[PDB]
Write an enzyme that holds these catalytic residues in place. Structure first.
Site, mmCIF file in Angstrom:
data_model
loop_
_atom_site.group_PDB
_atom_site.id
_atom_site.type_symbol
_atom_site.label_atom_id
_atom_site.label_comp_id
_atom_site.label_asym_id
_atom_site.label_seq_id
_atom_site.Cartn_x
_atom_site.Cartn_y
_atom_site.Cartn_z
ATOM 1 N N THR A 140 0.980 -1.551 -0.197
ATOM 2 C CA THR A 140 -0.099 0.220 -0.078
ATOM 3 C C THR A 140 0.436 0.919 0.127
ATOM 4 N N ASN A 152 6.078 -1.748 3.469
ATOM 5 C CA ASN A 152 5.428 -1.918 4.563
ATOM 6 C C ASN A 152 6.015 -1.848 5.647
ATOM 7 N N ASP A 189 -4.343 0.643 -5.852
ATOM 8 C CA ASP A 189 -3.116 0.978 -5.370
ATOM 9 C C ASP A 189 -2.048 -0.916 -5.377
ATOM 10 N N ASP A 230 22.228 2.165 -9.064
ATOM 11 C CA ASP A 230 21.035 3.103 -8.888
ATOM 12 C C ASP A 230 20.425 3.793 -10.181
ATOM 13 N N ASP A 259 27.069 4.436 -15.521
ATOM 14 C CA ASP A 259 28.171 3.837 -14.422
ATOM 15 C C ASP A 259 29.065 6.054 -15.246
HETATM 16 C C1 LIG Z 1 13.830 8.520 -10.850
HETATM 17 O O1 LIG Z 1 13.448 9.838 -10.712
HETATM 18 C C2 LIG Z 1 14.188 11.034 -9.516
HETATM 19 C C3 LIG Z 1 14.143 11.902 -9.602
HETATM 20 O O2 LIG Z 1 14.609 12.680 -9.848
HETATM 21 C C4 LIG Z 1 15.770 9.699 -9.580
HETATM 22 O O3 LIG Z 1 16.626 10.527 -8.399
HETATM 23 C C5 LIG Z 1 17.294 11.621 -8.882
HETATM 24 O O4 LIG Z 1 19.082 11.196 -8.765
HETATM 25 C C6 LIG Z 1 19.849 12.795 -8.974
HETATM 26 C C7 LIG Z 1 21.415 11.845 -9.749
HETATM 27 O O5 LIG Z 1 21.230 10.214 -8.298
HETATM 28 C C8 LIG Z 1 20.148 13.072 -7.451
HETATM 29 O O6 LIG Z 1 21.302 14.256 -7.332
HETATM 30 C C9 LIG Z 1 22.346 13.795 -6.172
HETATM 31 O O7 LIG Z 1 21.549 14.847 -5.243
HETATM 32 C C10 LIG Z 1 21.932 15.586 -4.697
HETATM 33 C C11 LIG Z 1 20.813 16.339 -3.959
HETATM 34 O O8 LIG Z 1 20.570 15.744 -3.202
HETATM 35 C C12 LIG Z 1 18.809 16.275 -2.359
HETATM 36 O O9 LIG Z 1 18.194 17.201 -2.327
HETATM 37 C C13 LIG Z 1 16.822 16.934 -3.632
HETATM 38 C C14 LIG Z 1 16.381 18.107 -3.890
HETATM 39 O O10 LIG Z 1 15.118 18.592 -3.414
HETATM 40 C C15 LIG Z 1 16.063 15.403 -2.670
HETATM 41 O O11 LIG Z 1 15.042 15.032 -4.063
HETATM 42 C C16 LIG Z 1 17.471 14.557 -2.020
HETATM 43 O O12 LIG Z 1 16.581 13.563 -1.659
HETATM 44 C C17 LIG Z 1 17.271 12.506 -2.148
HETATM 45 O O13 LIG Z 1 17.715 12.397 0.542
HETATM 46 C C18 LIG Z 1 17.412 11.727 0.995
HETATM 47 C C19 LIG Z 1 17.795 10.602 0.912
HETATM 48 O O14 LIG Z 1 18.422 10.254 2.854
HETATM 49 C C20 LIG Z 1 15.651 11.127 1.164
HETATM 50 O O15 LIG Z 1 14.717 12.556 1.774
HETATM 51 C C21 LIG Z 1 14.966 10.577 -0.504
HETATM 52 O O16 LIG Z 1 14.073 9.837 -0.853
HETATM 53 C C22 LIG Z 1 15.898 10.373 -1.386
HETATM 54 O O17 LIG Z 1 16.932 9.428 -1.517
HETATM 55 C C23 LIG Z 1 17.286 9.092 -2.747
HETATM 56 O O18 LIG Z 1 18.292 9.283 -3.264
HETATM 57 C C24 LIG Z 1 19.363 9.863 -2.631
HETATM 58 C C25 LIG Z 1 20.422 10.343 -3.883
HETATM 59 O O19 LIG Z 1 20.162 11.533 -3.262
HETATM 60 C C26 LIG Z 1 19.643 8.166 -2.606
HETATM 61 O O20 LIG Z 1 20.614 7.891 -2.442
HETATM 62 C C27 LIG Z 1 18.981 7.290 -1.671
HETATM 63 O O21 LIG Z 1 18.941 5.742 -1.344
HETATM 64 C C28 LIG Z 1 17.256 7.591 -2.510
HETATM 65 O O22 LIG Z 1 17.283 6.487 -3.353
HETATM 66 C C29 LIG Z 1 18.829 14.756 -1.563
HETATM 67 O O23 LIG Z 1 17.912 15.164 -0.090
HETATM 68 C C30 LIG Z 1 23.057 15.852 -4.727
HETATM 69 O O24 LIG Z 1 23.927 16.353 -3.157
HETATM 70 C C31 LIG Z 1 24.338 14.761 -5.134
HETATM 71 O O25 LIG Z 1 25.463 15.683 -6.091
HETATM 72 C C32 LIG Z 1 27.009 14.972 -6.785
HETATM 73 O O26 LIG Z 1 27.450 14.401 -7.275
HETATM 74 C C33 LIG Z 1 27.175 15.587 -9.284
HETATM 75 C C34 LIG Z 1 27.272 14.913 -10.068
HETATM 76 O O27 LIG Z 1 26.848 16.188 -10.226
HETATM 77 C C35 LIG Z 1 28.425 16.578 -8.250
HETATM 78 O O28 LIG Z 1 27.639 18.038 -8.900
HETATM 79 C C36 LIG Z 1 28.965 16.936 -6.746
HETATM 80 O O29 LIG Z 1 30.124 15.841 -6.987
HETATM 81 C C37 LIG Z 1 27.910 16.275 -5.875
HETATM 82 O O30 LIG Z 1 29.543 14.637 -5.555
HETATM 83 C C38 LIG Z 1 29.146 15.705 -4.039
HETATM 84 O O31 LIG Z 1 28.728 14.072 -3.889
HETATM 85 C C39 LIG Z 1 28.791 13.381 -3.600
HETATM 86 C C40 LIG Z 1 27.783 11.872 -3.164
HETATM 87 O O32 LIG Z 1 27.642 12.565 -1.907
HETATM 88 C C41 LIG Z 1 30.012 12.770 -2.471
HETATM 89 O O33 LIG Z 1 30.481 11.158 -3.125
HETATM 90 C C42 LIG Z 1 30.869 14.051 -3.381
HETATM 91 O O34 LIG Z 1 32.826 13.019 -3.586
HETATM 92 C C43 LIG Z 1 30.981 15.163 -3.659
HETATM 93 O O35 LIG Z 1 30.367 15.618 -1.629
HETATM 94 C C44 LIG Z 1 23.406 14.561 -6.852
HETATM 95 O O36 LIG Z 1 22.801 15.301 -7.777
HETATM 96 C C45 LIG Z 1 18.666 13.119 -7.140
HETATM 97 O O37 LIG Z 1 18.814 13.451 -5.417
HETATM 98 C C46 LIG Z 1 17.515 12.357 -7.304
HETATM 99 N N1 LIG Z 1 16.476 12.696 -6.121
HETATM 100 C C47 LIG Z 1 15.322 11.525 -5.733
HETATM 101 C C48 LIG Z 1 14.339 12.284 -5.050
HETATM 102 O O38 LIG Z 1 15.811 10.302 -5.598
HETATM 103 C C49 LIG Z 1 16.525 8.681 -9.927
HETATM 104 O O39 LIG Z 1 17.637 8.409 -10.443
HETATM 105 C C50 LIG Z 1 15.311 8.361 -10.924
HETATM 106 N N2 LIG Z 1 15.644 6.665 -11.584
HETATM 107 C C51 LIG Z 1 16.183 6.275 -12.056
HETATM 108 C C52 LIG Z 1 16.276 4.959 -12.633
HETATM 109 O O40 LIG Z 1 16.220 6.786 -13.018
HETATM 110 C C1 LIG Z 2 -3.426 4.718 2.669
HETATM 111 N N1 LIG Z 2 -3.964 5.200 3.409
HETATM 112 C C2 LIG Z 2 -4.179 5.386 4.291
HETATM 113 C C3 LIG Z 2 -3.957 3.828 5.784
HETATM 114 O O1 LIG Z 2 -2.573 3.314 5.232
HETATM 115 N N2 LIG Z 2 -4.037 3.861 6.795
HETATM 116 C C4 LIG Z 2 -3.811 3.088 7.852
HETATM 117 C C5 LIG Z 2 -2.170 2.819 8.118
HETATM 118 S S1 LIG Z 2 -3.189 3.266 9.697
HETATM 119 O O2 LIG Z 2 -2.561 1.907 9.950
HETATM 120 O O3 LIG Z 2 -2.667 4.689 9.826
HETATM 121 C C6 LIG Z 2 -4.542 2.772 8.917
HETATM 122 C C7 LIG Z 2 -5.024 6.164 5.305
HETATM 123 N N3 LIG Z 2 -5.433 7.513 3.959
HETATM 124 C C8 LIG Z 2 -4.589 6.679 2.902
HETATM 125 C C9 LIG Z 2 -4.601 7.713 1.923
HETATM 126 O O4 LIG Z 2 -2.966 8.002 1.509
HETATM 127 C C10 LIG Z 2 -3.098 7.927 0.002
HETATM 128 C C11 LIG Z 2 -4.042 8.554 -1.004
HETATM 129 C C12 LIG Z 2 -3.147 8.493 -1.889
HETATM 130 CL CL1 LIG Z 2 -4.334 8.704 -2.903
HETATM 131 C C13 LIG Z 2 -2.099 8.922 -2.251
HETATM 132 C C14 LIG Z 2 -1.866 9.384 -3.077
HETATM 133 N N4 LIG Z 2 -1.193 9.817 -4.470
HETATM 134 C C15 LIG Z 2 -1.189 9.101 -1.749
HETATM 135 C C16 LIG Z 2 -1.783 8.412 0.117
HETATM 136 C C17 LIG Z 2 -0.298 8.701 0.816
HETATM 137 C C18 LIG Z 2 -0.310 6.717 2.030
HETATM 138 C C19 LIG Z 2 0.975 8.305 0.774
HETATM 139 C C20 LIG Z 2 -1.088 9.630 2.055
HETATM 140 CA CA LIG Z 3 -3.296 -1.507 -0.089
HETATM 141 CA CA LIG Z 4 25.531 3.300 -11.854
HETATM 142 CL CL LIG Z 5 7.087 -4.701 3.337
HETATM 143 ZN ZN LIG Z 6 -3.587 -5.115 1.871
#
Ligand SMILES: *[C@@H]1O[C@H](CO)[C@@H](O[C@@H]2O[C@H](CO)[C@@H](O[C@@H]3O[C@H](CO[C@H]4O[C@H](CO)[C@@H](O)[C@H](O[C@H]5O[C@H](CO)[C@@H](O)[C@H](O)[C@@H]5O[C@H]5O[C@H](CO)[C@@H](O)[C@H](O)[C@@H]5O)[C@@H]4O)[C@@H](O)[C@H](O[C@H]4O[C@H](CO)[C@@H](O)[C@H](O)[C@@H]4O[C@H]4O[C@H](CO)[C@@H](O)[C@H](O)[C@@H]4O)[C@@H]3O)[C@H](O)[C@H]2NC(C)=O)[C@H](O)[C@H]1NC(C)=O
Ligand SMILES: Cn1c(C(=O)NC2CS(=O)(=O)C2)cnc1COc1cc(Cl)c(C#N)cc1C(C)(C)C
Ligand SMILES: [Ca+2]
Ligand SMILES: [Ca+2]
Ligand SMILES: [Cl-]
Ligand SMILES: [Zn+2]
Ligand SMILES: [Cl-]
Ligand SMILES: [K+]
Ligand code: NA
EC number: 3.1.4.39
Length: 804
Positions: A159, A180, A308, A687, A691
């Site tokens: 979910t 979950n 979902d 990722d 690479d």
């Molecule tokens: C699917 O779509 C998504 C979204 O478009 C793609 O993901 C993007 O990929 C980009 C490239 O990998 C990535 O960009 C990096 O982000 C850094 C900035 O990060 C923060 O800010 C943003 C914006 O608000 C935010 O969304 C990020 O969110 C992650 O962070 C936390 C994790 O703890 C969570 O809240 C969130 O869930 C999210 O986690 C996910 O992403 C992270 C990585 O960001 C993963 O590790 C997790 O597992 C999870 O998957 C961030 O909070 C930026 O810092 C990076 O910059 C480095 O590289 C550039 C290269 O140009 C360079 O300028 C520098 O060298 C820099 O390097 C320095 O840092 C290095 C790494 O730490 C270090 O080793 C060096 O030596 C240097 O110090 C980079 O730009 C973008 O963040 C994500 N976005 C999301 C939302 O995930 C995804 O790729 C797509 N998938 C496919 C298959 O296509």
């Molecule tokens: C799934 N959910 C619960 C739930 O799970 N309740 C149980 C866990 S409990 O144990 O608290 C009882 C309550 N209301 C929702 C609906 O949430 C969504 C709905 C939609 Cl349409 C979208 C989108 N796009 C995203 C979400 C969330 C999950 C990202 C907020």
């Molecule tokens: Ca469900």
């Molecule tokens: Ca890679």
């Molecule tokens: Cl799970």
């Molecule tokens: Zn279920």
């Protein structure tokens, strides 16, 4: 500590969260123990139920009523949803004929058609046909609007992962909600559905639609609904918000139903007890549409009816126990059920060994109902690895099964008959999409698509610029009447070199041999023509792939194939060739078995060498264009060029050779020719993204030849298979794969047998979208076709699933 002795008077389901310790009247208030003392009395009224009756028509307003049938109710926005039907001779929305909504028909002050997302938990795709008789409102939405036969969820098919993917357009690996239940070692914290932990924002990554909306000046209703708020009141609350003044009224809303999942878990997907939950969801849809119709919004609002995940038959007796495989079973923590995730009980345990856990789980029983993987080895189409919350060890559980640590886990924590969470390609996990409203098409079927695509559409529907996501924007334009996003092809970054003959044979010292010294003027001009690209229209049908990063590469033409040869990685990025239905398969002649030939178009310093493969005892080589499909004995020599060679583990060469020798020709025969593009992929940090060379962790011993993590192929033909692949006038048909380049075939339990019994089954498990390959390669395919770009984007998102 809240001070719950302020009042909810005139603040019921207020949209802005007032901040602790003022007391709250929005609807997370319940989950935080923070509701004002009078919340239930004022905001959760139930008196007289939810339906006007003839005797209530024109009543005197009584403010204790749950909903109203008094003359002033429409202007107050709080009538019972059936008010006009009962009290004004109106028809239920479902009883009205389907009438095309060519333009939004909105009340004054409406700047844009609102969007209502109506999400239904566990609504399996086949409910649309199998429950059609008891769901008249849903069937009307479906037949009158735009619908797919099913929508593919993300993995795991649970979910929170799927709803939050809906809201962000991101894979769970990227948004962070990877199950979950989860552990985040960096936080050091645990996440569960129950508990208050799940409310901490640190879990929830990316940018969900309500935040996208709010940042860009569009107001949103709540997406999370408290379990104790009944559905009738969630609907009334939405309709009440829709009667707010223009400056206060949200444009996007969500309604969520716990059903039919809740009953499906108890009764199985098609249990007799499931008819009633479907009827009840349908009645709720009826209430919404009748409420919209009262407010004159039923030809203004875009409605998305979406699930979902589905539901499969799962029982207590179909449980595999890790205690039947491991002896060390108390040294692990299993996240159990329809998937498994394994990590160490203690990170003070230096004796914990993943490799021995995997080996103890691999093909240990003849009908074993789970398969272990290091997460980097999971099918790339699952996109389930690049998150610290996803444990290194994963178990893919067979549909209809569970995995558990020990039997006591199943009876000290039988009941359930349905569950979900399996591989997202499984038929029983597929769910539903219907879009109905002015912006969707009228009476239109669309092909199945993935739920990661919907965020972009919802943003389009609301005039919002989507945050960066995993959708392919444009791929769903065909769902829409208007508000299309007119994507443009990405610009090529690196232009190819076109080398001629620049090197004499003796300049090479690669340690290669070929038996190829066997001397016409008719055939002399011909070979020249082929090396300059004379057959390239046959072998490169959709233009050359564009290289979307900075690099150095050469186009090489040949009679039978064309390649883009990387001077940096010392091998092709891509190799393109067409195999007609009539093509003949041949053998590698005896004298040519170990033949490798320097390419006089490419410098020794940018070539692989045979010595490295000789010295590397683990590593062998294969060829991207298969010698077996050479057009002529003379053309075959081209396939042995050192520029067609790629590193391959002997174990992988079993797979590759069978694909090249048997399956390509099979596909050409079935599909009336195919075009094949094959190449390497390097994803050492798992990722999902190409690479750079400084990320490669493995090379052919003693060389700069990088070892691929995977090999891909894209296999395209005419959708109208009466037309040959190389002379196709209309839409295309594609299948693709990303095979893991592994030094053993431990993944395939039947691999000691002939390839005819296991290889194709492996390849099916590793089916892929063209777009998956694009991310992994930085290439852009299908650049030159007859087809519209939106159609090509749809094709690039297609997944061939091999379900019945
Ligand atoms: C699917 O779509 C998504 C979204 O478009 C793609 O993901 C993007 O990929 C980009 C490239 O990998 C990535 O960009 C990096 O982000 C850094 C900035 O990060 C923060 O800010 C943003 C914006 O608000 C935010 O969304 C990020 O969110 C992650 O962070 C936390 C994790 O703890 C969570 O809240 C969130 O869930 C999210 O986690 C996910 O992403 C992270 C990585 O960001 C993963 O590790 C997790 O597992 C999870 O998957 C961030 O909070 C930026 O810092 C990076 O910059 C480095 O590289 C550039 C290269 O140009 C360079 O300028 C520098 O060298 C820099 O390097 C320095 O840092 C290095 C790494 O730490 C270090 O080793 C060096 O030596 C240097 O110090 C980079 O730009 C973008 O963040 C994500 N976005 C999301 C939302 O995930 C995804 O790729 C797509 N998938 C496919 C298959 O296509
Ligand atoms: C799934 N959910 C619960 C739930 O799970 N309740 C149980 C866990 S409990 O144990 O608290 C009882 C309550 N209301 C929702 C609906 O949430 C969504 C709905 C939609 Cl349409 C979208 C989108 N796009 C995203 C979400 C969330 C999950 C990202 C907020
Ligand atoms: Ca469900
Ligand atoms: Ca890679
Ligand atoms: Cl799970
Ligand atoms: Zn279920
Ligand atoms: Cl919802
Ligand atoms: K070798
Ligand atoms: Na095996």
């Amino acid at each position: 500590w809240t001070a719950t002795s302020g009042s909810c008077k005139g603040r019921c389901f207020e949209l802005q969260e007032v901040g602790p310790p003022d007391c709250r009247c929005d609807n997370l208030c319940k989950s935080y123990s923070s509701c004002c003392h009078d919340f239930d009395e004022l905001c959760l009224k139930t008196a007289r139920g939810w339906e006007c009756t003839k005797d209530r028509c024109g009543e005197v307003r009584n403010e204790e009523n749950a909903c109203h049938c008094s003359e002033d109710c429409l202007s107050r926005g709080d009538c019972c949803t059936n008010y006009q039907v009962v009290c004004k001779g109106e028809s239920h929305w479902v009883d009205d004929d389907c009438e095309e909504i060519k333009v939004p028909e909105c009340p004054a002050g409406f700047v844009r058609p609102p969007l209502i997302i109506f999400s239904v938990d566990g609504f399996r795709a086949s409910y649309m046909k199998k429950g059609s008789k008891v769901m008249p409102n849903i069937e009307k939405l479906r037949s009158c609007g735009t619908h797919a036969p099913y929508m593919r969820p993300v993995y795991p098919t649970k979910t929170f992962p799927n709803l939050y993917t809906l809201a962000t357009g991101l894979y769970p690996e990227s948004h962070g909600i990877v199950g979950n239940s989860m552990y985040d070692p960096v936080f050091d914290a645990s996440f569960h559905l129950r508990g208050r932990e799940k409310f901490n924002h640190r879990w929830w990554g990316g940018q969900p639609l309500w935040i996208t909306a709010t940042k860009q000046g569009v107001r949103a209703g709540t997406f999370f609904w408290s379990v104790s708020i009944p559905h009738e009141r969630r609907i009334l609350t939405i309709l009440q918000w829709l009667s707010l003044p223009d400056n206060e009224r949200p444009s996007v809303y969500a309604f969520y139903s716990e059903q039919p999942d809740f009953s499906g878990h108890k009764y199985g997907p098609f249990g007799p007890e499931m008819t009633n939950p479907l009827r009840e969801i349908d009645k709720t849809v009826g209430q919404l549409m009748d409420g919209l119709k009262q407010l004159r919004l039923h030809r203004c609002v875009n409605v998305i009816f979406v699930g979902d995940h589905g539901m499969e038959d799962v029982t207590c007796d179909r449980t595999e126990f890790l205690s039947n495989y491991l002896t060390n079973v108390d040294d692990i923590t299993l996240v159990p059920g329809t998937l498994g995730r394994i990590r160490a009980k203690s990170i003070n345990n230096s004796k914990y060994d993943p490799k021995t856990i995997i080996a103890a789980l691999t093909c240990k029983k003849p009908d074993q109902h789970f398969k272990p993987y290091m997460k980097q080895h999971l099918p790339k189409r699952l996109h389930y690895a690049n998150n610290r919350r996803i444990e290194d060890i994963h178990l893919l559980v067979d549909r209809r099964w569970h995995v558990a640590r020990k039997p006591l886990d199943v009876y000290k924590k039988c009941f359930f008959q349905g569950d979900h969470g399996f591989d997202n390609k499984v038929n029983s996990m597929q769910t539903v999409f219907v879009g109905y409203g002015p912006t969707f098409k009228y009476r239109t079927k669309v092909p199945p698509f993935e739920n990661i695509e919907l965020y972009n559409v919802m943003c389009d529907l609301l005039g919002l610029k989507p945050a960066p996501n995993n959708g392919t924007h444009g791929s769903l334009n065909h769902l829409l009447r208007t508000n299309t996003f007119r994507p443009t092809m990405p610009d090529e970054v690196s232009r190819p070199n076109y080398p001629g003959i620049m090197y004499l044979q003796s300049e090479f010292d690669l340690g290669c041999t070929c038996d190829d010294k066997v001397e016409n003027k008719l055939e002399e001009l011909n070979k020249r023509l082929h090396t300059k690209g004379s057959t390239k229209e046959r072998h490169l049908l959709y233009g050359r792939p564009a290289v979307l990063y900075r690099t150095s590469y050469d186009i090489l033409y040949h009679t039978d194939f064309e390649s883009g040869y990387s001077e940096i990685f010392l091998m092709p990025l891509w190799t393109s060739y067409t195999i007609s239905k009539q093509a003949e398969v041949s053998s590698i002649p005896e004298h040519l078995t170990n033949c490798v030939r320097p390419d006089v178009r490419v410098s020794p310093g940018f070539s692989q060498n045979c010595l490295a493969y000789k010295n590397d005892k683990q590593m062998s080589y294969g060829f991207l264009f298969p010698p077996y499909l050479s057009s002529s004995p003379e053309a075959k020599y081209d396939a042995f060029l050192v520029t067609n060679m790629v590193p391959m583990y002997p174990a992988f060469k079993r797979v590759w050779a069978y694909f090249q020798r048997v399956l390509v020709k099979k596909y050409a025969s079935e599909r009336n020719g195919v075009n094949v593009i094959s190449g390497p992929i390097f994803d050492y940090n798992y990722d999902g993204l190409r690479d750079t060379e400084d990320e490669i962790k493995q090379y052919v011993e003693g060389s700069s030849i990088p070892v691929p993590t995977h090999y891909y192929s894209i296999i395209t033909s005419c959708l109208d298979f009466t037309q040959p692949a190389d002379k196709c006038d209309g839409p295309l048909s594609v299948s693709s794969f990303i095979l893991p380049h592994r030094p053993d075939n431990d993944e395939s339990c039947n691999s000691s047998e002939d390839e005819s019994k296991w290889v194709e089954e492996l390849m099916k498990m590793h089916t892929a979208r063209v777009r998956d390959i694009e991310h992994l390669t930085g290439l852009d395919f299908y650049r030159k076709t007859s087809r519209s770009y939106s159609e090509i984007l749809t094709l690039k998102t297609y997944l061939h699933t091999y379900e019945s």
